[PDB]
Amino acid sequence: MTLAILAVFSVALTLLGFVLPPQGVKRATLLGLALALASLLLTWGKPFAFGPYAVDGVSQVFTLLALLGALWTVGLVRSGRFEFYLLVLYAALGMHLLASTRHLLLMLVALEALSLPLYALATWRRGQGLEAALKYFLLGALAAAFFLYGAALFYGATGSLVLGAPGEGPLYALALGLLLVGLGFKAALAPFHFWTPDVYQGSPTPVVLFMATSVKAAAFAALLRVAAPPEALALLVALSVVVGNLAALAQKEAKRLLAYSSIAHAGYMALALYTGNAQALGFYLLTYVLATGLAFAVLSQISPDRVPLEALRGLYRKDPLLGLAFLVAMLSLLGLPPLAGFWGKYLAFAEAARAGAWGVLVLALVTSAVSAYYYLGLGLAVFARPEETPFRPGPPWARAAVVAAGVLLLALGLLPGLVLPALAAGG
Amino acid sequence: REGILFTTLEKLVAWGRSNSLWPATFGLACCAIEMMASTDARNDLARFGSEVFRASPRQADVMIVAGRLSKKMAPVMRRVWEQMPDPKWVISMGACASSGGMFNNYAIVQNVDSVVPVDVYVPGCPPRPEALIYAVMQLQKKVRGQAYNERGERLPPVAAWKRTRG
Amino acid sequence: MTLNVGPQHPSTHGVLRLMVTLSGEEVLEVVPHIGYLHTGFEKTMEHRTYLQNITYTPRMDYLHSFAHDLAYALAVEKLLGAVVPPRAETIRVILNELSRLASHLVFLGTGLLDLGALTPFFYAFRERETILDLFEWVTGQRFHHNYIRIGGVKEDLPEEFVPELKKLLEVLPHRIDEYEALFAESPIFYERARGVGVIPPEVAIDLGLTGGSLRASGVNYDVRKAYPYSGYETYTFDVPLGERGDVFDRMLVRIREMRESVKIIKQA
Amino acid sequence: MSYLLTSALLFALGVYGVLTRRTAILVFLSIELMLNAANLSLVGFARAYGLDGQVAALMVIAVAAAEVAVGLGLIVAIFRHRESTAVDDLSELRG
Amino acid sequence: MSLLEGLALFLLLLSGVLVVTLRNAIHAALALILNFLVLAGVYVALDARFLGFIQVIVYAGAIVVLFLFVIMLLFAAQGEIGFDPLVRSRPLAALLALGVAGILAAGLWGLDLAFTQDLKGGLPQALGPLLYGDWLFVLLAVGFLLMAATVVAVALVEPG
Amino acid sequence: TWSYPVDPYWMVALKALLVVVGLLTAFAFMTLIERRLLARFQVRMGPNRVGPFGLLQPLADAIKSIFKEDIVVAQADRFLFVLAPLISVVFALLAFGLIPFGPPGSFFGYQPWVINLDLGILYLFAVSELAVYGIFLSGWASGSKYSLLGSLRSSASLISYELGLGLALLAPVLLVGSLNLNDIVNWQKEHGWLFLYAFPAFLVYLIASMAEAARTPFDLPEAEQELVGGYHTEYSSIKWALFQMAEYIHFITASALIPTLFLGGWTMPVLEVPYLWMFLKIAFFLFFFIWIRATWFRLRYDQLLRFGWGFLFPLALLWFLVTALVVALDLPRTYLLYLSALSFLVLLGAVLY
Amino acid sequence: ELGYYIVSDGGSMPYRVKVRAPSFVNLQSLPYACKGEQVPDMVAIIASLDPVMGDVDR
Amino acid sequence: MAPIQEYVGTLIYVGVALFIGVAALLVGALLGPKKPGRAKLMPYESGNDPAGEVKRFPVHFYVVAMLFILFDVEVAFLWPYAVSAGGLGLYGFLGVLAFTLLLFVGFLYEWWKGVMR
Ligand code: SF4
């Protein structure tokens, strides 16, 4: 019904865009997304299924996030190839579609649907991003097959093709794994994440924005609907979080660092699943998204192409406001209070503690200190060094946006008791 | 291994071969224009096993060397000849080819038979189409072995063992 | 790539070796490579008599044989200042125009054959035979002729020549039309021909094109009008013309020519 | 039952396939086989559970096809300015 | 049954072996079609007849040709050095192959079921209405997926 | 079949065997008629010697084909060379036993087909992919990129048209509610011959089957007197004959299907004469194509690609959709009748100016 | 355009026979004529101009 | 269900054809004399047909190929629908129409864009 809008706009634009000038298409596309986004908000607390399409609060929330991220990315585009809008739209719908289901076959299709156009967006013909593309594609296609066999084994273990199935011993135990890998890769859980660093290094900032938001969201969305072994879960997480931060020491490449971080973050999100508290998981992802979204915008404003550490420094000179924003971000990303990141962590942990999982949590905590290295490594770098190299100033659109974002960050830090109320299932 | 060496086979196969003649014309002269004439429009050739009238040796083994030629054409023709299958016949059509009519010159090649062996000459430039018919009737009964020379002397049923075949 | 289309193919039968620089789906340029036949007639004929040279003249034009012959004849005739009887001159035009028709028959015959539908060739050929039969009559030769002789042709016309000549002039108009009938409609004919064969009139002269290429681009340039030679001065007939260099145009010109030629016969 | 064992083998073989293949395109081929391995399994189970695994299959096929096409499209776009012939002939993202 | 049945599955597997052996592209590709013949046959044999045909039509009929056309487009291959001919990795790959089946095998020595939901076997007849309703979503999704795919593909190739 | 005969493994075999060689002899004498009918058509005498009527000339021809070198040339691989014609002929042969020849249980009381299935349309459609496989393969096999490129054109184009044939076959399945031939035939047995019902689908089908390999778009590059098909001219003897053979077998196969479809093959309420009525329909379309084939031109595939793709296929499915509307609400089939007839009438009226 | 440029020295044979061969000159205009054309079209474009090879070859 | 008889029959048919096929080739093969390819470097067109300065080919052809697959899938779905067509009512009809309409959109994009030259 919001979905209704999406499909329509997408399809309509498809042909329409041929006649329209690309600028008119940027205008159009912006409107559509926003319109869908609005209606979503405005339909909060209306629980409506049609079939496998089955809207709840969770669905609503996670697709909220997805559209948000995409709105941001769409902002930035200043190259005349109309396709880099067109495809994004599509993809967004695909993830909407992904979220509101529990019927496996649609879910499968849906995973593929969002990933395909993503590949294309991986190319503005930057040579690295094609190398990247290829690897990624092939790896994706592998994960597909797993995910497909898993589904087949779900039909195997029970005639069900929809979750909320009755479950069994061994085979189902297998089966859940064969899905979890697929989902894992898309959420870039270790050791299925690897490509994401390489690809990010190769890929342009904006692209990454969308990916780093939406895909993770989406993956988790579906993951929640699945019910998983806590020991398995624990393994994955550990490795993810460990390897991530350790490798993040190695860096020179901001983006690639951030990839590693969001694997740690992915692990952290994955805690929630013992309970399956989607208030918590909702909360988390919102927070994560914001910071990361913010970060890449700025990074783009530097250059849309490979960035060294040095490029970051002296940012307060370049613009103060942005420097502060970005700082706040890093701290939130540290999870530091009195930013929302603290709550996100806390919440996850609380559900973890309900599960009583100790070791896991301990490990988690260790590495959560680790992360601060590079966060200050950037966030503070802003304030030091009188040098800087050419950068650009951007539109007021994005600038303002960013500053809004940073205020919203620390705002929810201070007022978490706002969202929690309507993260029950929204409201 | 070609359909011979029992009474039956050789007559059989030879009838087959003889009656299926597929002409590949090697125009480069006036001959061609008379050759299209020679095809249709008064007389036929389809009643002599010919729908093949066109440029593939991949369709034919009856070589009609039709027209006056130059130095530049000799290796070409040679090679074209080579890119035919193993049994193959050489008609030397018309005077222009056969011994070089009224030209004695460096440019030209006289006595086309130089370039490739021949089994049939058919003089006249122009000849009549019909002469060519008479010629292939010859060539028919020639490969049938029911022929001689003007001295009563027998000869092989092919053009292709007068110089090397391939 | 540079594609090498060799001699004698497929049924186009130029000695043609053609270096087609392609885009792998287009032609860019052709460097034609030719000259794989040659004799050096021009040489040889200095080693034969003038009479003898008349042997050589139709032996380099499969088509209108008699024109070469005539042109050579004229040159000689001029040189020593010899004149030609009026009747002779009558005959000469008749053969010439008959030979033009022949040429056209062969042109279009091949045109069809070359590509497009194959068949109508055979009909055009039927007519060609008729023409040939006429030649056979008078010169005893299917083609190649020596009937034309210095001072005028070497003997009188057959009486038999008169019936048959009328006869074929009767049939032909209708026939001509029916060949034409195949072309102008057939919207596929359009789609194969119209766009292609381009070249400016200006460049036609610069690179040298001659009538029915030049006049195929509708540029009036009959050498029979411009440098009018025998009899044609006193014969009416007009120039058939196109108005652009394309295949499409060429083809229609020729048909019109034939009709003009026929009226000239009629006049004759 | 046999067939369903067979299906798992065919998948396994396919994995070995994917891993051996040096050139990329053949990888992609190996994958396709795996996809059908699944679907075979699925068919067996459809006899059990009543042919929803048919409808499933149909869908699977279509997606697979889709995913083929576009990937090959990508392969094209990679090597219409390259003479390379395997995935790891592009390597610079590695650190 | 198990003689011929056995064979057919053997053959199927056999086809698999070939495609993972060969480094003669055509032969490879072609084998995979022969695969799909068997596989289809077995579908039909297992009363999935409609499915039998669709396998034939699409998966075999369409796809591999498309594959070949690319390998033609860009020329075949045969050259066995990566930068790393990873020859050491051949047995290690084969190890993983054993495991991944092995684990499934364990699960299935204890698996038990019948196959007895029999109605009319794979025939689009009874499947249509269901498809048109329950799977309808899926259908529409599909239709969109493909269309998007088209757009993608186009955009990938040409400048523009 | 759920109401239809069965016959022994042996009887099945016999019928098959017969039908194969029957189609050999078919092809032979078909050539004869084609040659002679061509001659006559272009006012000419033809094969008449070695006959009478050139009867034995095909024998000669065949014999010619054999007793020859038949070799693979360097820069090709042996296996591929051998396979590449083979494939095409098998799959050309295959698909004809599906189609009947008369009323049920009436081939001397035995069934008038060799296979009959239950899934008519599918089988046909399926076989349609496999010939083109043979084609392009040959191209590649040959190892001239010249041959290859032709084959790519060919196949591409063919395959384009192949799809339109798909969009055609849905339409009658609507009407009968089934896809097996017999029933389809029988549908016409009550109501009447199917082109009445759907003239533009008859039409569009017709012209799509043209687009089959048949020497009748009559450029492809085809082989015989143009730039050549790459499935030839890199071939020799018998193998070459096979290709040529195949093209013709297609031609007739298509010529058979069109009767199958739009008429009954032997339905004719006026009289039942099984075999006769089959041939008569065959004959009609056969000549019909050949008349086109003669009097119409070689068509640049450039043009063709533009032509089919953009105009022809979209209009075909469009017609289907309309019919589907009607059929979905299950309305008077009269309601199509008027329209079908009219569209033809329109598009017929469109010819003259 | 046809014509013969004939130098005679007054012998019994000419001292020069030049032949003006039109078609030959017309062929010069072929790379031009066939600029940027389409590949199946190129065959016809040759044919349409009428080659008699005698002009060319001489 | 369906009778197993004709499917069986399919296998039979295939067995016949293939045999006769194989028979023909061995006749052809075994007959005729054999000589070396001593004077074989090319087989069509003296002056040497071009290859090996080609290795690229228009993607045009790719486009077509890719297209075709997508549409073959289209058809696939419309078969169940065709069969059961009546009785699925308007609700049927609307679903299908939509689906179709999507693929008609496909065509229109690549056509108006026309990068298949
Ligand atoms: S013999 Fe006469 S007709 Fe033949 S090529 Fe020579 S000149 Fe021409």
Swiss-Prot record, chain A:
Cell compartments where the protein resides: Cell inner membrane
Family (UniProt): Belongs to the complex I subunit 2 family.
UniProt GO MF annotations: NADH dehydrogenase (ubiquinone) activity; NADH:ubiquinone reductase (non-electrogenic) activity; quinone binding
Subunit: NDH-1 is composed of 15 different subunits, Nqo1 to Nqo15. The complex has a L-shaped structure, with the hydrophobic arm (subunits Nqo7, Nqo8 and Nqo10 to Nqo14) embedded in the membrane and the hydrophilic peripheral arm (subunits Nqo1 to Nqo6, Nqo9 and Nqo15) protruding into the bacterial cytoplasm. The hydrophilic domain contains all the redox centers.
Role summary: NDH-1 shuttles electrons from NADH, via FMN and iron-sulfur (Fe-S) centers, to quinones in the respiratory chain. The immediate electron acceptor for the enzyme in this species is menaquinone. Couples the redox reaction to proton translocation (for every two electrons transferred, four hydrogen ions are translocated across the cytoplasmic membrane), and thus conserves the redox energy in a proton gradient required for the synthesis of ATP.
Record's protein name: NADH-quinone oxidoreductase subunit 14
TM region positions: 1-21, 30-50, 57-77, 79-99, 104-124, 137-157, 172-192, 204-224, 230-250, 257-277, 280-300, 322-342, 360-380, 400-420
Membrane topology: Multi-pass membrane protein
GO cellular component, one term: plasma membrane
Encoding gene, per UniProt annotation: nqo14
E.C. number: 7.1.1.-
Group of enzyme by EC: translocase
Main subcellular localisation: membrane
GO BP, one annotated term: ATP synthesis coupled electron transport
Disulfide bonds: none
UniProtKB/Swiss-Prot annotation, chain F:
EC class of the enzyme, as a word: translocase
MF (Gene Ontology): NADH dehydrogenase activity; oxidoreductase activity, acting on NAD(P)H, quinone or similar compound as acceptor; quinone binding
Keywords assigned: Cell inner membrane, Cell membrane, Membrane, NAD, Quinone, Translocase, Transmembrane, Transmembrane helix
Parts of the chain that traverse the membrane: 10-30, 79-99, 119-139, 156-176, 191-211, 251-271, 272-292, 309-329, 335-353
Protein EC: 7.1.1.-
Catalytic activity field: a quinone + NADH + 5 H(+)(in) = a quinol + NAD(+) + 4 H(+)(out)
Top-level lineage group: Bacteria
Location relative to the cell: Cell inner membrane
Biological process terms in GO annotation: aerobic respiration
GO CC entries: plasma membrane
Chief localization: membrane
PROSITE patterns for the chain: COMPLEX1_ND1_1 (PS00667), COMPLEX1_ND1_2 (PS00668)
Protein topology in the membrane: Multi-pass membrane protein
Pfam families documented for this protein: NADHdh
Record text on subunit structure and interactions: NDH-1 is composed of 15 different subunits, Nqo1 to Nqo15. The complex has a L-shaped structure, with the hydrophobic arm (subunits Nqo7, Nqo8 and Nqo10 to Nqo14) embedded in the membrane and the hydrophilic peripheral arm (subunits Nqo1 to Nqo6, Nqo9 and Nqo15) protruding into the bacterial cytoplasm. The hydrophilic domain contains all the redox centers.
Protein family membership: Belongs to the complex I subunit 1 family.
Protein name from the UniProt record: NADH-quinone oxidoreductase subunit 8
This protein's encoding gene: nqo8
Curated annotation (Swiss-Prot), chain G:
Disulfide bond annotation, renumbered to this chain: none
The species this protein was found in: Thermus thermophilus (strain ATCC 27634 / DSM 579 / HB8)
Annotated localization: Cell membrane
Superkingdom, taxonomy of origin: Bacteria
Family from the record: Belongs to the complex I 49 kDa subunit family.
Function: NDH-1 shuttles electrons from NADH, via FMN and iron-sulfur (Fe-S) centers, to quinones in the respiratory chain. The immediate electron acceptor for the enzyme in this species is menaquinone. Couples the redox reaction to proton translocation (for every two electrons transferred, four hydrogen ions are translocated across the cytoplasmic membrane), and thus conserves the redox energy in a proton gradient required for the synthesis of ATP. The Nqo4 subunit may contain the quinone-binding site.
Subunit structure, interactors included: NDH-1 is composed of 15 different subunits, Nqo1 to Nqo15. The complex has a L-shaped structure, with the hydrophobic arm (subunits Nqo7, Nqo8 and Nqo10 to Nqo14) embedded in the membrane and the hydrophilic peripheral arm (subunits Nqo1 to Nqo6, Nqo9 and Nqo15) protruding into the bacterial cytoplasm. The hydrophilic domain contains all the redox centers. This subunit interacts extensively with Nqo6.
Name used for this protein in its record: NADH-quinone oxidoreductase subunit 4
Complete-protein stretch covered: 352 to 409 of 409
From Swiss-Prot, chain H:
Spans traversing the lipid bilayer: 11-31, 59-79, 88-108
Gene of this entry: nqo7
Family according to the record: Belongs to the complex I subunit 3 family.
The protein's Enzyme Commission number: 7.1.1.-
Gene source species: Thermus thermophilus (strain ATCC 27634 / DSM 579 / HB8)
Name of the featured protein: NADH-quinone oxidoreductase subunit 7
Subcellular location(s) of the protein: Cell inner membrane
Main location group: membrane
Top-level taxon: Bacteria
